[PDB]
Amino acid sequence: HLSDMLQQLHSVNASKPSERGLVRQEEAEDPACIPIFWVSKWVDYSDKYGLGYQLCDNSVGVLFNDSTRLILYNDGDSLQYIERDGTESYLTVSSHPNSLMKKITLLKYFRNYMSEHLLKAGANITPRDELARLPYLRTWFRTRSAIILHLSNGSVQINFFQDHTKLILCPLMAAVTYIDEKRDFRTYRLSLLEEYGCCKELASRLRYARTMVDKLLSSRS
């Protein structure tokens, strides 16, 4: 649904939400669109192993450098492994093929580091069945200013390094959650931002998001 996201961003940006009359950003909030999942923590160890991350439900995942993925559900034991060719298999930390020993060890290190050392993004929010299929990290990249995280449920999260602000874009809800410098977490319907406007700070970040979605679309493999 990246193409849908691109269309939704074209539409909001074309409405020039910060450049017209009275901004009524609060009227664009839609609590029914609060995301179910976002990335709460991440560790870039890609020069050796991969990108580890925690989702807001306390599950963790790793996208390894060989393009395989391991997902640990928040029960702390149930695992999903996704091979290069896309085959999904289910196992546990306690019961797994010997061939997965190294990758499970790596996941445990990532999980323990994130639990001990990093702040949980969106920590005050209850999100929207903890064994139901989790989204996984489809791809990610970094720029000088941000990390861009594309989840398999279509959501795209952009974390800006310098000011700690974040966007969570969902093309199914056609919504964006903005986490500002004060850690206020607010979810907007994109078409209501068109209707009611928004501040220049959110508008600028939505222009950046469109450029990042074009990058995702032009680099999918």
């Binding site: 923590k41 160890y45 580091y113 050392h117 702040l119």
Partner: peptide, 5 residues
């Protein structure tokens, strides 16, 4: 940065 906040 090589990890989140």
């Amino acid at each position: 940065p090589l990890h989140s906040t």
